[PDB]
Tab-separated table of C-alpha atoms in Angstrom:
chain	number	residue	atom	x	y	z
A	1	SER	CA	-23.602	42.485	60.686
A	2	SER	CA	-24.358	38.979	61.922
A	3	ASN	CA	-22.692	36.896	59.219
A	4	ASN	CA	-20.550	37.359	56.110
A	5	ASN	CA	-23.830	37.237	54.187
A	6	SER	CA	-24.961	40.421	55.941
A	7	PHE	CA	-26.015	43.212	53.589
A	8	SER	CA	-23.595	45.811	55.009
A	9	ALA	CA	-20.676	43.410	54.502
A	10	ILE	CA	-21.472	42.746	50.851
A	11	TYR	CA	-22.410	46.388	50.354
A	12	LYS	CA	-18.967	47.462	51.554
A	13	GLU	CA	-17.249	45.117	49.086
A	14	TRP	CA	-19.429	46.403	46.265
A	15	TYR	CA	-19.053	49.989	47.514
A	16	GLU	CA	-15.252	49.933	47.651
A	17	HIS	CA	-15.287	48.298	44.232
A	18	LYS	CA	-17.545	51.007	42.787
A	19	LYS	CA	-15.428	53.563	44.663
A	20	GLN	CA	-12.908	53.168	41.850
A	21	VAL	CA	-15.606	54.115	39.350
A	22	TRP	CA	-17.464	56.981	41.005
A	23	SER	CA	-15.995	60.167	42.410
A	24	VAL	CA	-14.675	59.774	45.962
A	25	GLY	CA	-16.937	62.512	47.343
A	26	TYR	CA	-19.933	61.065	45.551
A	27	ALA	CA	-19.124	57.523	46.671
A	28	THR	CA	-18.706	58.518	50.322
A	29	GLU	CA	-22.025	60.360	50.536
A	30	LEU	CA	-23.723	57.754	48.341
A	31	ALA	CA	-22.863	55.192	50.983
A	32	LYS	CA	-23.722	57.706	53.712
A	33	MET	CA	-27.313	58.186	52.489
A	34	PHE	CA	-27.626	54.449	51.873
A	35	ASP	CA	-26.357	53.699	55.391
A	36	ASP	CA	-28.555	56.421	56.870
A	37	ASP	CA	-31.826	55.033	55.513
A	38	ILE	CA	-31.083	51.396	54.586
A	39	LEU	CA	-29.151	50.395	57.728
A	40	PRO	CA	-32.083	51.066	60.164
A	41	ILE	CA	-34.187	48.898	57.849
A	42	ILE	CA	-32.124	45.980	56.485
A	43	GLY	CA	-28.473	46.923	56.975
A	44	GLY	CA	-27.597	44.397	59.636
A	45	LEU	CA	-29.724	41.714	58.020
A	46	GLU	CA	-28.498	38.917	55.784
A	47	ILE	CA	-28.876	39.639	52.078
A	48	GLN	CA	-30.524	36.234	51.664
A	49	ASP	CA	-32.681	36.710	54.756
A	50	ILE	CA	-34.204	40.085	53.892
A	51	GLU	CA	-37.995	40.262	53.915
A	52	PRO	CA	-39.760	41.515	50.738
A	53	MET	CA	-41.658	44.148	52.732
A	54	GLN	CA	-38.421	45.304	54.373
A	55	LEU	CA	-36.816	46.037	51.032
A	56	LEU	CA	-40.031	47.881	50.201
A	57	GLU	CA	-39.693	49.670	53.549
A	58	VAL	CA	-36.375	51.017	52.265
A	59	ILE	CA	-38.146	52.329	49.172
A	60	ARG	CA	-40.914	53.540	51.512
A	61	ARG	CA	-38.282	55.446	53.472
A	62	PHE	CA	-37.200	57.438	50.412
A	63	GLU	CA	-40.566	57.676	48.619
A	64	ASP	CA	-42.405	59.113	51.625
A	65	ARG	CA	-39.928	61.999	51.664
A	66	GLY	CA	-40.707	62.655	48.012
A	67	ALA	CA	-37.386	61.303	46.826
A	68	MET	CA	-38.741	59.327	43.885
A	69	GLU	CA	-35.427	59.058	42.056
A	70	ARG	CA	-33.653	58.102	45.270
A	71	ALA	CA	-36.322	55.527	46.150
A	72	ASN	CA	-35.829	53.923	42.751
A	73	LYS	CA	-32.081	54.376	43.165
A	74	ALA	CA	-32.316	52.448	46.425
A	75	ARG	CA	-34.092	49.591	44.644
A	76	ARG	CA	-31.474	49.869	41.880
A	77	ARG	CA	-28.435	49.644	44.133
A	78	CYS	CA	-30.033	47.045	46.391
A	79	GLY	CA	-30.695	44.832	43.376
A	80	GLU	CA	-27.177	45.664	42.236
A	81	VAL	CA	-25.838	44.366	45.571
A	82	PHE	CA	-28.157	41.347	45.323
A	83	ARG	CA	-26.610	40.694	41.914
A	84	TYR	CA	-23.133	41.020	43.414
A	85	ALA	CA	-24.041	38.488	46.112
A	86	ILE	CA	-25.190	36.024	43.450
A	87	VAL	CA	-21.907	36.466	41.578
A	88	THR	CA	-19.781	35.947	44.688
A	89	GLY	CA	-21.890	32.895	45.520
A	90	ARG	CA	-23.560	34.128	48.697
A	91	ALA	CA	-27.151	34.159	47.495
A	92	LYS	CA	-28.809	31.912	44.931
A	93	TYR	CA	-32.135	33.722	45.051
A	94	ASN	CA	-32.737	37.408	45.679
A	95	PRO	CA	-36.109	38.923	46.735
A	96	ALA	CA	-35.787	41.534	43.974
A	97	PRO	CA	-39.004	40.287	42.212
A	98	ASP	CA	-40.642	40.159	45.651
A	99	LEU	CA	-39.842	43.852	46.031
A	100	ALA	CA	-41.990	44.537	42.974
A	101	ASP	CA	-44.767	42.300	44.277
A	102	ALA	CA	-44.689	43.976	47.690
A	103	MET	CA	-44.742	47.454	46.142
A	104	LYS	CA	-47.662	46.356	43.964
A	105	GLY	CA	-49.546	44.667	46.780
A	106	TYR	CA	-48.952	47.613	49.101
A	107	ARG	CA	-51.896	49.323	47.380
A	108	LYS	CA	-54.079	46.920	49.359
A	109	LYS	CA	-53.023	48.742	52.519
A	110	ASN	CA	-53.005	52.254	51.094
A	111	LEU	CA	-56.533	52.092	49.741
A	112	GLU	CA	-58.044	54.147	46.947
A	113	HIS	CA	-61.075	56.441	47.119
A	114	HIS	CA	-62.861	54.465	44.434
A	115	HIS	CA	-62.159	50.919	43.323
A	116	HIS	CA	-62.029	49.128	39.997
A	117	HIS	CA	-64.669	46.628	41.105
A	118	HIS	CA	-68.225	46.915	42.422
């Protein structure tokens, strides 16, 4: 965590806030799985300074294991934290739309077997 705008910092605030909504055991391990996969990717980065492909790399992390719901849940909670950062006045713009663009454009790296053009 470099600055106060670091993802982990804001995540903790949001986490401890949501901790009063979710079950304690659920909340703890929810953070645990988020920390386990997200932290190596974008955890120590600034929420405003996160690369579009890095957020997609988080989704990549879960999707490649087959965890489709969890990959989408990552995107969900990340965007949820992005939202929280906008509310607290840390970020004005969040690369949430960029996540979608990166996920879409990623099919230009993972090629098909036949294309839609000739």
